[PDB]
Structures are given as structure tokens and as C-alpha cells.
Amino acid sequence: QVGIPKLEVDHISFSNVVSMMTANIRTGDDMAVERVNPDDVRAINIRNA
């Protein structure tokens, strides 16, 4: 037989396999971009969707 889900039944199980990251996910290398503006505001194509 296959093992019964722990959440299926009313017993309390005080040991479980907790998935976890090996280290902090906040490395500190936050993403940064180079925004570069339109050259002429008049020249922008607002049109077409």
C-alpha cells in the first residue's frame, strides 16, 4: 500500500520533511536597469494599439 497523506487523517505528526533553501535568497544583487527616454516627444508613435 501507498502511504496515507498526513493531512488526510486526524493524527498529529511531529516530524516532517520541510523543504528549504540552503541559504538566504536576498543575495543583495538587486536588479537594476538602464531606462533610456524617447529622443523627441513629438516623434513618439502613440498610435497602433
Next chain:
Amino acid sequence: VHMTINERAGMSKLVADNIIASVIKSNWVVDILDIEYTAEVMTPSEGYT
């Protein structure tokens, strides 16, 4: 590569630098059509000012 740049606007500065670097190390020939300029014909005696 004989790359043509009809318009510089919106180009990443890192990309413009990479293109010139290709111009030098891969012998790219890159024709920028956006530019307007005047010219002065120096005599050899006056050199580039």
C-alpha cells in the same frame, strides 16, 4: 558585419560600446546614418586641431 544604424536613439550605451569594440576586434563596418556634421580639411602643416 556591415551593420547599419539608421537611428541611434534608445540604444544601450553598453551596446554602442560593444559595437565599436566589434568595429575594432572583429573589423565590423558600421554605418550610422543618423549623424550630421561639418568638415574641415586641415593641411598637413596644421595637423588635427
